[PDB]
C-alpha cells in the first residue's frame, strides 16, 4: 500500500513519539519510516493494544499512542492513514 521509496526515507520524530520509540528500544534520534513501524509494532505488542477476537484493530485509548495519534482505536489495514497519523509526530 506504501511505496517502498516512502518507507526507506529518513525522518525525525518529534520528543512524544521518540520516548515511545525508545521505551522498546529505539537508541537514535533519526529513522526511516519502515523503522518506525517496526518500533511501533514492537510498542503494540509489548503493551498487548492488540485484541484477539477482532485482531486488525488497535486499542489505544488511555495510552500515549492515542494521544499521539488523535484516536482511541484505529485498523491495521489502513496504510496510508496510519502513515499520515505519524507525519503528524514527526519533525
Ligand atoms: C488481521 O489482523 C491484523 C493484520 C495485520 C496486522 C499488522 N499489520 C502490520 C502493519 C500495519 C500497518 C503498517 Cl503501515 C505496516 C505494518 C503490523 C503493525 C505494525 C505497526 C502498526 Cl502501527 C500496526 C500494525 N501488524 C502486525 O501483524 N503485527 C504488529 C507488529 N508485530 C507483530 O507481531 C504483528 C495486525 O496487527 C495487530 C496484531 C496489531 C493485525
Given at each position: 500500500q506504501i511505496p517502498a521509496s516512502?518507507?526507506?526515507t529518513l525522518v525525525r520524530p518529534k520528543p512524544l513519539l521518540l520516548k515511545l520509540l525508545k521505551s522498546?528500544?529505539?537508541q537514535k534520534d533519526t529513522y526511516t519510516?519502515?523503522?518506525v513501524?517496526?518500533?511501533l509494532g514492537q510498542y503494540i505488542m509489548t503493551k498487548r493494544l492488540y485484541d484477539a477476537?477482532?485482531?486488525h484493530?488497535?486499542?489505544?485509548?488511555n495510552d500515549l499512542l492515542?494521544?499521539?495519534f488523535g484516536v482511541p482505536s484505529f485498523s491495521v489495514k489502513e496504510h496510508r492513514?496510519?502513515?499520515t497519523m505519524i507525519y503528524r509526530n514527526l519533525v
Open positions: 516512502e518507507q526507506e522498546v528500544g529505539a519510516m519502515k523503522e513501524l517496526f518500533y477476537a477482532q485482531q484493530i488497535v486499542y489505544c485509548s492515542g494521544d499521539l492513514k496510519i502513515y
